[PDB]
């Protein structure tokens, strides 16, 4: 699924996103446009094996098991392929325990490089919530 700008926003405030952690609601709009391109089946493969999926790109290195990255953790408890789903819970559920385990969302490379610092109301400004 490819979700509009607008109607993420709302999902994700719906989801307990909004100032989650002291994460305003754009910070989370913003990091998934550049991870993602709001699409919920985005897969990424890093060079050590692991892949990164769905809306906010969450690696199979710790967080999600796929089967297929040799000594890697699943500290959400969750098959890989559940984040992929239109549905954006489990996406939500696990970036919020990797937003809480101390290095808030410096985790996300594309959040870090291109939304860090900048006018991140701008991502939400105009949408219904
Ligand atoms: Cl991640
Ligand atoms: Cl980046
Ligand atoms: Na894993």
Redesign the pocket.
């Known amino acids: 699924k490819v979700f509009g700008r607008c109607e993420l926003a709302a999902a994700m405030k719906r989801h307990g996103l909004d100032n989650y952690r002291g994460y305003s609601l754009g910070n989370w709009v913003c990091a998934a446009k ?1 991870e993602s391109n709001f699409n919920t089946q985005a897969t990424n493969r890093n060079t050590d094996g692991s892949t990164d999926y769905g809306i906010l790109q969450i690696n199979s290195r710790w967080w999600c098991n796929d089967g297929r990255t040799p000594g890697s953790r699943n500290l959400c408890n969750i098959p890989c392929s559940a984040l992929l789903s239109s549905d954006i819970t489990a996406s939500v559920n696990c970036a919020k325990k990797i937003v809480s385990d101390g290095n808030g969302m410096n985790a996300w ?2 959040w ?3 939304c860090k610092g900048t006018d991140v109301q701008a991502w939400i400004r105009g949408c219904r919530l």
């Open positions: 550049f490379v594309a870090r490089n291109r």
